[PDB]
Design a protein around this nucleic acid. Structure first.
Lengths: 97, 81, 104, 94, 93, 106, 83, 97
DNA sequence: TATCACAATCCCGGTGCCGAGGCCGCTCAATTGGTCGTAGACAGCTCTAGCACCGCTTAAACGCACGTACGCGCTGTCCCCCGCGTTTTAACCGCCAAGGGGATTACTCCCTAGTCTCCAGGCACGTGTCAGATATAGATTGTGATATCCT
DNA sequence: AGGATATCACAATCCATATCTGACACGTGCCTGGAGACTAGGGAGTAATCCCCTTGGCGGTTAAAACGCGGGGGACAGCGCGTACGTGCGTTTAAGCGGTGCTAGAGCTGTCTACGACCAATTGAGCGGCCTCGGCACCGGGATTGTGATA
């Protein structure tokens, strides 16, 4: 039947997610990930229901900020696809490791 | 105990994160890589958070602990405490 | 009696700000012009950000400033986005911005 | 019973004076309160360091004015210094 | 003639005990003195903020221990803690 | 009269560091152990950097530590380069390093 | 009093080539020189303005080494070797 | 007579300047540039002979640090030449403007 | 694909010079000893408040088939960037005179801490109304496939 | 016989409206902390010197920069092609919600106790300043990998 050409559902998704301001990761998998990470620093911890929310907001802001720079670095090389080379280059220019 | 939760950051979640960032087309090897990045960021923050907590002799990681852990990496977060 | 924050035409509490400076371990002695000056600049920054936020909320057919509008009005201004260098705003979304190469 | 102080009523006064017909949600007020705390601590810390480099012991208006000039960029700092001067003058006129 | 109050001779002592046959220039002495100053200011600032968050008023050794655990990265913060604890313990004796 | 540095087994000054804490406006009152602890960490970090710098200077048949050797010994250490992250060192040069894709292929 | 004009062209091409070589660059395009002069001018304004603020705060006219060191430190560019 | 192929004098220069630690800009043009810039913030200033030295050290460290990232960004795009696109990309990723 | 002549690079070493190390006198600040107010460690208690589980949905994830466009690889052009040689222009070094500004010291007068008191401004708590969110529906729109008009 | 191209059809976004709940604006009670008023005081403004150190000038050397030519190599354009990513459909599965019980931790209050500030006096450690030398730069010169031209 109908079939959108590759690169219009993508732009509609871009325009939809850049507009709304929800949380993009499912709260429960992220909370379990946070607890599994914290297991290595103090056994039998306890997390407020808002500390996890702050960690998730910070994490999503960080990943979005990283993908913006990865996209710039990908466009720099005559492309539109982003590959791990771009992420690693962005994280090297920004000074992380 | 919990094992292998970094797979909870599913591939569609990463697609949505990239779409908010402005990416039109994502390679197939990004996803795994991205998880790595995430699993490092948290390790650098949560640790500080825990350090800010067991110093106050407490046992519950507050939201101010996370806010301070962020602030001491130049990543201030407005909205929590 | 007469309030100090209202003695200088301000809206931010000069008394509370002065007590915070004193009991905050910044210097030993703290003048009486420091509280008023600090409160004046704090109120100016609040007025500017709130004005731009209200404008951005009206240009979106709403009546209540939500975090979305403060993020919009902060990233969409030069000096303010310079003052907000590394600030994440919870529930702020991002600026709507598609590149030029990705367009059809 | 415990209490905590915030800049809620002051930010709300400023809003009702600059935008008389516009409310402000709860989360936005928490954001503006965090913003005020942060800018306050930045200006005050820089002023402390300034009054410590010159071996002084008093954070007068001079230190706050210079700290505002150092932190706020460009046209922001100019207007902020102007407002601070006007306020100090009005108050000193008793 | 006001006095200049630096960490020159202490850095020199440490060097002469850890590398007994090598000297140190004047530029390198200035660099190490400024380095000690900067690390001192970082650690003291963090200890101050830690005392301030917990509604305390004293900078005990607990706060300096935590400030070191925050600023110094990875494996350094273990040996620095060991040295500090050993020094305090020998002081109390 | 014995110096507190000697009692605590250090070389760095405990008295001077304690005073510097008391008059720096860090808190209202400062405990006895804080000075000793801070001095111990300062001396340890100094020992680390100076040891590595002396090594890097001996690798050039030079018996004197210059800024160049401090830079070489700090950038070639993961943890110290993480501690000197945003720091410039005057007269320090940079690390000898050429990217692969610039060398002549054959 | 002197008035100096057109000094950014004093940073000549071979100096920029030397900087690039130290940075590790093998081949330099021809339009990098004006761009580098621009970047340099911007950084220098940003640092000299803070240095002059620190100087004229302490009621002085002589921009001291420590005023520059502070103007740099308050940009996250700590500079060991002049304090 | 003799003629080195393009790309060996370059590498010899790279190996020579990465090794020595002098100052790479002539002191007098840089000092005049600093004074001409400061003219716009306070007329009839006065510079210590060491403040100019600190400004020059900071400036050269900044420019070297920028050229390292520009070189990475140029190699990213299948090149060895560095163009203004690379400098602008590096200064955008690092967060400057 | 193996060999040759030349253009840096490196090491030996000899001189000097100069920047590091040793040493002296003072002087300022670290140490010692009481005395005291002060905050901080400690036990109990009441109450949140985060953890655990479970039932039930249902929205979101996963896996597969396909087929389209994008990354990549090869070739060719020619523009532009490096190497090299000459000339000269402006940096470097230094010697120095003016002088302008920064540091110091003593006075003093202004502005801030400390303390008790008391009133009024701010915070927790209820209360109800208004605006954001949700559900349908219609009209506006932007995208994609196609017959038709050109070469 | 295919491309251009205006043209026709269809899924998605967006106003317009009712309606609905919850989240904010508003009034109230109470408390705690800010404002006066007085006292003591010590820190910053003012003045005067003075010494030092920064600007300006010049004058000589000399090496770094500017220019101009010439050759090569590398960046860009152009095309083919293979694959790998987006799109869509259908099944399944955990995430969300809400709800209840449990206990663990946390904030608060009184209680004590040990500890750190304050002050007065003492001496020793360290700093500025003057000598003495040994590591480093600097130059000449011999030996050594390396690089483009030969074959």
């Amino acid at each position: 039947p109908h079939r959108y050409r590759p690169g219009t559902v993508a732009l509609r998704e871009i325009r939809r997610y850049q507009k709304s301001t929800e949380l993009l990761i499912r709260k429960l998998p992220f909370q379990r990930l946070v607890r599994e990470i914290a297991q290595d620093f103090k056994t039998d911890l306890r997390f407020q229901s808002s500390a996890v929310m702050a960690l998730q907001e910070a994490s999503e802001a960080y990943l979005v900020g990283l993908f913006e720079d990865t996209n710039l670095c990908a466009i720099h090389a005559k492309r539109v696809t982003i590959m791990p080379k771009d992420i690693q280059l962005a994280r090297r220019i920004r000074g992380e490791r | 105990v919990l094992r292998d939760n970094i797979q909870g950051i599913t591939k569609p979640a990463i697609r949505r994160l990239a779409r908010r960032g402005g990416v039109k087309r994502i390679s197939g090897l990004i996803y795994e890589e991205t998880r790595g990045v995430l699993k490092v960021f948290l390790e650098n923050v949560i640790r500080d958070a825990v350090t800010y907590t067991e110093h106050a002799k407490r046992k519950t990681v507050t939201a101010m602990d996370v806010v301070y852990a962020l602030k001491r990496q130049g990543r201030t977060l407005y909205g929590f405490g | 009696k007469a309030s100090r924050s209202a003695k200088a035409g301000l809206q931010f509490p000069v008394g509370r700000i002065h007590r915070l400076l004193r009991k905050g371990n910044y210097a030993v002695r703290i003048g009486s012009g420091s509280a008023i000056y600090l409160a004046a600049t704090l109120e100016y920054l609040c007025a500017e950000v709130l004005e731009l936020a209200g404008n951005a909320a009206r240009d979106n057919k709403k009546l209540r400033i939500m975090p979305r509008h403060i993020q919009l009005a902060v990233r969409n201004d030069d000096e303010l986005a310079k003052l907000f260098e590394g600030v994440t705003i919870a529930d702020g979304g991002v600026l709507p911005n598609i590149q030029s190469a990705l367009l059809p | 019973k415990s209490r905590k102080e915030s800049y809620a009523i002051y930010v709300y006064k400023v809003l009702k004076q600059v935008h008389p017909d516009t409310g402000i949600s709860s989360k936005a007020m928490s954001i503006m309160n965090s913003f005020v705390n942060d800018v306050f601590e930045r200006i005050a810390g820089e002023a402390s360091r300034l009054a410590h480099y010159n071996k002084r012991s008093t954070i007068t208006s001079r230190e706050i004015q210079t700290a505002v000039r150092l932190l706020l960029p460009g046209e922001l700092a100019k207007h902020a210094v102007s407002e601070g001067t006007k306020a100090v003058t009005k108050y000193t006129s008793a």
